[PDB]
């Protein structure tokens, strides 16, 4: 019976390929020919934030563009102050290995996870004057890679067990579970309308999900190797992905196809982080050449090369006001660019 | 006004306390060594862990007032190409391979080759722990299993002159075990720009001197790294 199913799957593949070909028109490059180049965007290290011992694996900003959270393999979760360049907290950790740190949208909780297969919730605005563990989410079988809050009580978490699940903090049970992938998912990025989320795995594909219905609306292909970082667009109609193939591509859900590719013949190492700007014109990426890069999203020319790190970069972040960019790297240092 | 001054003074005091605690933690974190245990199901990784003991599984032991930490990632799927990068700054890796069986020796060799040539693990040395010596000797001595069937190069190999067999031993088992070791050493010496080396050892089930071996290996690796950075041969 599986042979007949594969045959009709091939028929559906023919149909979808015909639709993709018929929906294609003149390339977006030919119409972007009329735009003017932006120029060389050069920014310097305004401040440096030292104090970490081991490498930095993740970083996330707050909602008021003042506080940021960092995670390291020592086991320290530090909350900094970008303006005064001084610390406010230092939470010890149980498991040293962590790949994710998150900040609540209202700035009351901070969550983290790693190889321990569990996600922890912390209390910041506590009345006892000390950070304590609130809940310990458990149930996944793979390692955690990315987790984000939704409003105050629901967190969407992705793991290497080929599945993504949504929890609720009050009772700690999986309300819904998504299973459409075949590799290991690594990234998440919630849409601005807070209705849909996209994911990317080690199968060179991206999946768009819906929280209530719980089904995969559409699937995108067009990459060779595994995907490492994903993001979103402020409009909510497009997103960009990075891969070990060392090329960046932009996908549009309205057209269900690919629009642009971002690569140069002199690059060998792959992308490790992607982060959009405020207006959506400046695209920032992180590579493994012990430096960073700046790209024009609408055009393709590489304009701007940040440098200063002694090891590979790990994280990238653009704040809500779009006034600073934070870059973390395995040299145990943090820098702020303006 | 004055309230703002009180606030920034309190913030500075918090910074001072946090910095002092961070310095205290840095004093301790730099004195403990970490090790990784990567092996196979047949290999007695749990057995050696238990010997030097007396999700991720930890274990503690200390020798000559030097602290040692080991890790065992034994709760994930088969794929390991992504979570193996989290051990980039680990002093050494302990590798356990079986020698009695011959079917998965090629798989073990492929694992070693993959580890030895990665872009984030080329500065990390390894410690071979060839195990199951009694089984290998008993099974080779009896017969009914020829190495030439699985490895058609045993006919052209001769015992090394530097070999030091245990005096109550038949030469054939020594030839076999040294051929097994020589294959791993041949994979090792092909690459490596004088930055990391592999230390071979022979280990059986009943062993009680395994901690000292890692002790001396770590000493050698530390001394080599220190000599490299001083431009002193």
């Amino acid at each position, epitope marked *: 019976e599986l042979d007949q199913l594969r045959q009709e799957a091939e028929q559906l593949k023919n149909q979808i390929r015909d639709a993709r070909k018929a929906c294609a028109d003149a390339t977006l490059s030919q119409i972007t020919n009329n735009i003017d180049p932006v120029g060389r965007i050069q920014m310097r290290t305004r401040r440096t934030l030292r104090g970490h011992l081991a490498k930095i694996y993740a970083m996330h900003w707050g909602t008021d563009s003042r506080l940021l959270v960092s995670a390291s393999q020592d086991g320290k979760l530090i909350i900094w102050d970008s303006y005064t360049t001084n610390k406010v907290h230092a939470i010890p950790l149980r498991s040293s290995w962590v790949m994710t740190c998150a900040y609540a949208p209202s700035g009351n909780y901070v969550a983290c996870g790693g190889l321990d297969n569990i996600c922890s919730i912390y209390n910041l605005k506590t009345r006892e004057g000390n950070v304590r563990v609130s809940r310990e989410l458990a149930g996944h079988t793979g390692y955690l890679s990315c987790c984000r809050f939704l409003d105050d009580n629901q967190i969407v978490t992705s793991s290497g067990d080929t599945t993504c699940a949504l929890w609720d903090i009050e009772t700690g049970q999986q309300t819904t579970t998504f299973t459409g992938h075949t590799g290991d998912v690594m990234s998440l990025s919630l849409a601005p309308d807070t209705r849909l989320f996209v994911s990317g795995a*080690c*199968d060179a594909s991206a999946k768009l999900w819906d929280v209530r219905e719980g089904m995969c609306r559409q699937t995108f292909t067009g990459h*060779e190797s595994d995907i490492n970082a994903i993001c979103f667009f402020p409009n909510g109609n497009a997103f960009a992905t990075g891969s*070990d193939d060392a090329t960046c591509r932009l996908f549009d859900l309205r057209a269900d196809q690919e629009l642009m590719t971002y690569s140069h013949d002199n690059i060998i190492c792959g992308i490790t982080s992607v982060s959009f700007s405020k207006s959506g014109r400046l695209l920032l990426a992180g590579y493994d050449d012990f430096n960073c890069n700046v790209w024009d999203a609408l055009k393709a020319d590489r304009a701007g090369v940040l440098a200063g790190h002694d090891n590979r970069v790990s994280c990238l972040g653009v704040t809500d006001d779009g006034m600073a960019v934070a870059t973390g790297s395995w040299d145990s240092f943090l820098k702020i660019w303006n | 006004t004055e309230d703002q001054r009180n606030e920034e003074k309190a913030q500075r005091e918090a910074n001072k306390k946090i910095e002092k605690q961070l310095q205290k933690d840095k004093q301790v974190y730099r004195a403990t060594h970490r090790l990784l245990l990567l092996g196979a199901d047949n290999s007695g990784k749990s057995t050696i862990v238990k010997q030097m003991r007396i999700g991720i599984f930890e274990t503690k032991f200390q020798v000559d007032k030097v602290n040692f930490h080991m890790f065992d990632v034994g709760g994930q799927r088969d*794929e390991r190409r992504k979570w193996i990068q989290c051990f980039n700054d680990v002093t050494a890796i302990i590798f356990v391979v079986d020698s009695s069986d011959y079917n998965r020796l090629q798989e073990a060799l492929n694992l070693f080759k993959s*580890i*030895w040539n990665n872009r984030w693990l080329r500065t990390i040395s390894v410690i071979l722990f060839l195990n199951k010596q009694d089984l290998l000797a008993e099974k080779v001595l009896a017969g009914k299993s020829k190495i030439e069937d*699985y490895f*058609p190069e045993f006919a052209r190999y001769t015992t090394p002159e530097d070999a030091t067999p245990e005096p109550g031993e038949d030469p054939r088992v020594t030839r076999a075990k040294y051929f097994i070791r020589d294959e791993f050493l041949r994979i090792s010496t092909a690459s490596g720009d004088g930055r990391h080396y592999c230390y071979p050892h022979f280990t059986c089930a009943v062993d009680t001197e395994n901690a000292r071996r890692i002790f001396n290996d770590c000493k050698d690796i530390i001394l080599q790294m220190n000599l490299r950075e001083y431009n002193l041969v």
Partner: nanobody
Amino acid sequence: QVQLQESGGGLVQPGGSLRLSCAASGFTFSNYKMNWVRQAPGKGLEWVSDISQSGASISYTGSVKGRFTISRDNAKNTLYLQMNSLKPEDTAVYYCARCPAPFTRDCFDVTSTTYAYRGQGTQVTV
């Protein structure tokens, strides 16, 4: 999309010869390392042969050394595995796998329960 389709296969008495092939599309052939994987009943996946991008370094398993040989052709985008001096123990399903990372000399996985870049397989019976 990434697809890998194998070819060849049939009931051949010992002493026969077959030339297998895998057709690769959707990715640049010239910047990857390729291999062959077989699976016998009651057995796990095993590795057989490998070849670099140019075609300089060639290695085989100990089971087959002069019996089988491998070769590639960039212009036609297909890998070839020669088969000589067939034996009854060489009965399995053949996949033409590819290592994940580009411009590299080490590659993991290949032999796993569920890899990402592998074909459906071709059956050879002796």
